[PDB]
Amino acid sequence: PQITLWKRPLVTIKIGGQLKEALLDTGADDTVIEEMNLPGRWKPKMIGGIGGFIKVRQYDQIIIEIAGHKAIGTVLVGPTPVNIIGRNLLTQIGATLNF
Amino acid sequence: PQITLWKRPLVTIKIGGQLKEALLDTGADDTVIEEMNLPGRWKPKMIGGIGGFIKVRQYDQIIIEIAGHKAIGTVLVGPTPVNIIGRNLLTQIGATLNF
């Protein structure tokens, strides 16, 4: 698709069997999805913000479908108020910014 | 331009006479630029993050040139570690996400 930006660029994703909504985020390095169970090993990781740090679980090579497009990458899972598709996955679905 | 996303989508901007680098950020509502003097009135505003809140100064109807493209909008100025062009300005330069 071609998505204008007058509202939050929210799309439907499919990850680990489930349907969720996620924000297409050119400002994020990494993809972060609210709490859920995913197959495979993971490793804890700390994400930094203005007041401090939040612990999440890094899973590698996860399959996710993003508005129809399949991709594979690292997904961080933890207590985020928004599901974010970061550049690690936007690159895998071929997304660009155009103006 | 058409910008791929393998690295941070950083562009040169021109605001208030000065050249700066800023991140094209589809995940931000608002544009936020590090400390500088701008003409006109402003009003304080609080931005929220994980550990708490950061005070910035909202200026309306500021001219900014973003990788060649002129736009006019609200710019928040304060102590941000990165210059962010949010959707309020990406909409004004006609930017879209495509995949």
Ligand SMILES: Cc1ccc(S(=O)(=O)NC(=O)NC2CCN(c3nccc(C(F)(F)F)n3)CC2)cc1
């Ligand atoms: C103005 C401005 C924009 C962006 C940045 S940044 O340093 O480029 N980004 C950034 O700092 N984002 C943090 C915001 C809070 N966020 C978060 N909030 C709640 C929960 C979770 C977690 F860990 F579960 F995923 N994460 C973490 C990233 C700086 C200044």
Ligand SMILES: Cc1ccc(S(=O)(=O)NC(=O)NC2CCN(c3nccc(C(F)(F)F)n3)CC2)cc1
């Ligand atoms: C995982 C995740 C991503 C994004 C969000 S969010 O709630 O969509 N975004 C967000 O929370 N961003 C905050 C990150 C820190 N940022 C900031 N950092 C330093 C300085 C300044 C200031 F005020 F000067 F501009 N701002 C504020 C925005 C949540 C979870």
Ligand SMILES: [Mg+2]
């Ligand atoms: Mg962000």
